[PDB]
Design a protein around this nucleic acid. Structure first.
Lengths: 97, 86, 101, 373
DNA sequence: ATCAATATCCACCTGCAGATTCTACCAAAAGTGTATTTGGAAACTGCTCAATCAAAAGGCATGTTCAGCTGGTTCAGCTGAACATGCCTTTTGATGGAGCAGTTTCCAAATACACTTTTGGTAGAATCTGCAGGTGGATATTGAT
DNA sequence: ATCAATATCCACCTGCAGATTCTACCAAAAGTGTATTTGGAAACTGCTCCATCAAAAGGCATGTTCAGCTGAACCAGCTGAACATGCCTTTTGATGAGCAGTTTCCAAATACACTTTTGGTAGAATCTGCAGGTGGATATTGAT
């Protein structure tokens, strides 16, 4: 009866997939790939933010730091669009409390 | 009798398999001396990675090498691997 | 028909290129690779065991690495107005990446 | 190690004269038994010519010798299929089938009384007594619930007792007509082998996966591990078999070891015979055996690249060691039989050896005699 | 071999930009004690690993061909290192004089933390359907007379 | 150039291996409220940075000249692809312990508050190795 609990990002990837291509499915291996990919990007960004924080003797990670790290790690137009989405997200979240 | 299959070692990584691998890279024509050198190269790569993996294994007081150890050992060499967790 | 039908040198290699590039299955057999890993691991630490997926992951990593190496090798070869890769090409590529040994 | 091999010679000193020395009364019997042990080893290096072969279906699990007659033997399969076979008869020996899948016979001794009978222990969960014609005479005990079955079995006639082991940790002890006063638990896990001493009647041995082997007193103990002795191990145990004389207990593990325990202070061992008989799932577990009239040991070798071999040549072969010394004296080998000799058993008679390999049964008697007119 | 022209390296000197040493002192280290958390030795258990034998599927070691690739030879350009000359962008070195890096205050914003109450993410039992595989037929790419 | 060979694409058919949908339930996420930081505005200062001038000055722009280099035809030979074969490796299915993975629990390990030193560091006061200078002995180079 003993049973563990392993979390993932699967269900959310499935949601996004159904949003962009309703008549399409995805296999377990690829979902695992996407899971590992998400984990990798998460680790890179958080580590980079940490390094920026530590270099400026600031003890708080904010949206600003994330934005900076994004501009550092990713190239060009991808950065700009993603940054747009992030800013839009913050503007929506901060208003409709 | 002397088989020890061809060396009981890397030489089981047979020639036509290396040929197929070179075919994946778009290559058309291969020299006869390539094979052995490639094998040596392969060994070195494996050696380094396996060493690191075994080291991770040694830290947890296990006798079973898990996939995670291979992933991390590959990540430190700048050859991160996706699709096996992490 | 009298004589066996015979393709010219190079064509079948190209056919192999397209066929293997279109697919994704692993080209090396499991068992020899298992034995190789087991031998090398035995020389560092004794009576180790290996999960199957770890062996699979090593297989994927090795094949991807070799594919990349042959790619750079082929470019170096083309640079010298040849079509035949040779050991010194591989040595050149690995020396440039810094994968010294 | 050494002293015999593919290249090295068996025979030590040429002391045969001692027989007449015994006729004079000077030299003692044990020295003579030593010399004739030597003789048997010498002629055993000419057992090399494999006499006979015999197949049947899926897998071998147990072996047993007809006590009175030399050339007759019984064997038990993975699928409850029993065979009885006699040599020099040519009457196409006798067979009996079972379910074939989950009915693995795991123990088999002949009937000391009615030679056409036999006891058996079965994966079905029924320690039975049954005839070579097929008729089941009597069940003796029962699981009464599947997925819990027996593994070990042995009997004694001088005391008229039967003993059997389970897959969880408990041992049962019956009379030859039922009348069960037992089924107290002895161990924590499966009981791989178990046996009774022949020269006394009333101390017992059992071995288990618990890394422990235990010596009991079946009339005196009743208190659920109010046992007599308990010997520990580093690994599990595949078999614990007594001597015929009763003073030397032999034990054989699953990883890499053989141990000789003595009458004198069961706890400590006399000697360790390191030798690989590594355990594995589909393989039949290996069972050392005594030779009834000497101080020899006979074992099947299953090489291991990780076992620290003293000898540089490691083949798939049958090894023969000395009991009260520690080192080896002979090695039987024959290609066309590169399988792994799971089981090996000598006759009570002394002129024959049987081997049970995967899907194969082998007979190793000598041959190539001279002729009559 | 043998002889002139510059380039490199040894020997000997000398004063100063950088190195080393000597103060004062103040932000870390150590001690002590007490509060908090944790890693590792026992009890279990359910997935997974270790490797044999028999029967069959698929691939590889070998040995026979022969097309075209390598690689050495020779040769017609060509173009890129040496080196002269004259002028000019840079070094150095100084001075001013604005602006920013970095400190110090401080307080209104922000967030960690201790609970309490909802809730959706995930193991596991019932459906399902796209694709692996298989059958069959039509076009494409090689290559010879 | 046109005909056979063979490889490969493409239409059509079927059942099953993952794909997909439906329960319980519990670790996880939101809400109150409070304790506790903490990062940005304001006020100052002195370090460092930026626009100018001037006197060389070593270095850069340009123009010759020719000795070595880069390719381009050509060909011997070699060496490695195509293919056939038999054979040998590899695959795949038969229904035991070992170890990854939990759960307890407490003896050891270590965070946190405060005081007592004390070693590290900025800046003043000496040292000195080595960057410049000078002079002469070979060491390369290159023509003859």
């Amino acid at each position: 009866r003993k049973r563990s609990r392993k979390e993932s990002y699967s269900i959310y990837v499935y949601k996004v997939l159904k949003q962009v291509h309703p008549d399409t499915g995805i296999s377990s291996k690829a979902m695992g790939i996407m899971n590992s990919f998400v984990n990798d990007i998460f680790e890179r960004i958080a580590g980079e933010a940490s390094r920026l924080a530590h270099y400026n003797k600031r003890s708080t990670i904010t949206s600003r730091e994330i934005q900076t790290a994004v501009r550092l790690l990713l190239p060009g137009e991808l950065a700009k669009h993603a940054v747009s989405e992030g800013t839009k997200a913050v503007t929506k979240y901060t208003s409709a409390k | 009798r002397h088989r020890k299959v061809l060396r009981d070692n890397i030489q089981g990584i047979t020639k036509p398999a290396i040929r197929r691998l070179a075919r994946r890279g778009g290559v058309k024509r291969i020299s006869g001396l390539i094979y052995e050198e490639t094998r040596g190269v392969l060994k070195v790569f494996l050696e380094n990675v396996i060493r690191d993996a075994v080291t991770y294994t040694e830290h947890a007081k296990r006798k079973t090498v898990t996939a995670m150890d291979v992933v991390y050992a590959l990540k430190r060499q700048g050859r991160t691997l996706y699709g096996f967790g992490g | 028909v009298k004589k066996p039908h015979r393709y010219r040198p190079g064509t079948v290699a190209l056919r192999e290129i397209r066929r293997y590039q279109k697919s994704t299955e692993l080209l090396i057999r499991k068992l020899p690779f298992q034995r190789l890993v087991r031998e090398i691991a035995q020389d560092f630490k004794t009576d180790l065991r290996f999960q199957s997926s770890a062996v699979m992951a090593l297989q994927e990593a090795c094949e991807a690495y070799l594919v990349g190496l042959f790619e750079d090798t082929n470019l170096c070869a083309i640079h010298a107005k040849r079509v035949t890769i040779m050991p010194k090409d591989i040595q050149l590529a690995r020396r440039i990446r810094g994968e010294r040994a | 190690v050494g002293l015999a091999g593919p290249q090295i010679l068996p025979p030590c000193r040429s002391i045969v004269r001692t027989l007449h020395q015994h006729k004079l009364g000077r030299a003692s019997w044990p020295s003579v038994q030593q010399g004739l042990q030597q003789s048997f080893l010498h002629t055993l290096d000419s057992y090399r010519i494999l006499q006979k072969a015999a197949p049947f279906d899926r897998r071998a699990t147990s072996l047993a010798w007809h006590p009175t007659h030399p050339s007759t033997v019984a064997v038990g399969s993975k699928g409850g299929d029993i065979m009885l076979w006699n040599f020099g008869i040519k009457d196409k020996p006798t067979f009996i089938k079972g379910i074939g899948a989950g009915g693995s016979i795991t123990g088999l001794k002949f009937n000391p009384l009615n030679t056409n009978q036999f006891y058996a222990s079965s994966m079905e969960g029924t320690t039975r007594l049954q005839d070579f014609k097929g008729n089941i005479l009597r069940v003796f005990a029962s699981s009464d619930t599947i997925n819990i079955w027996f593994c070990s079995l042995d009997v004694s006639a001088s005391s008229r007792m039967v003993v059997t082991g389970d897959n969880v940790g408990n041992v049962i002890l019956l009379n030859m007509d039922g009348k069960e006063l037992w089924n107290l638990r002895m161990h924590k896990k499966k009981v791989t082998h178990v046996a009774l001493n022949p020269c006394c009647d009333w101390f017992l041995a059992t071995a288990s996966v618990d890394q422990t082997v235990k010596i009991w007193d079946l009339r005196q103990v009743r208190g659920k591990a109010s046992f007599l002795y308990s010997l520990p191990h580093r690994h599990p145990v595949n078999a614990a078999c007594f001597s015929p004389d009763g003073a030397r207990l032999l034990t054989t593990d699953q990883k890499s070891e053989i141990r000789v325990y003595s009458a004198s202070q069961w706890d400590c061992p006399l000697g360790l015979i390191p030798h690989p008989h590594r355990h594995f799932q589909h393989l039949t577990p290996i069972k050392a055996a005594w030779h009834p009239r000497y101080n020899l040991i006979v074992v099947g070798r299953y090489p291991d690249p990780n076992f620290k071999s003293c000898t540089p040549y490691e083949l798939r072969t049958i090894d023969v060691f000395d009991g009260n010394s520690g080192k080896m004296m002979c090695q039987l080998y024959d290609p066309e039989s590169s399988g792994i000799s799971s089981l090996n058993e000598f006759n009570p008679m002394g002129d024959t050896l049987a081997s049970a390999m995967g899907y194969h049964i082998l007979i190793w008697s000598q041959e190539e005699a001279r002729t009559r007119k």
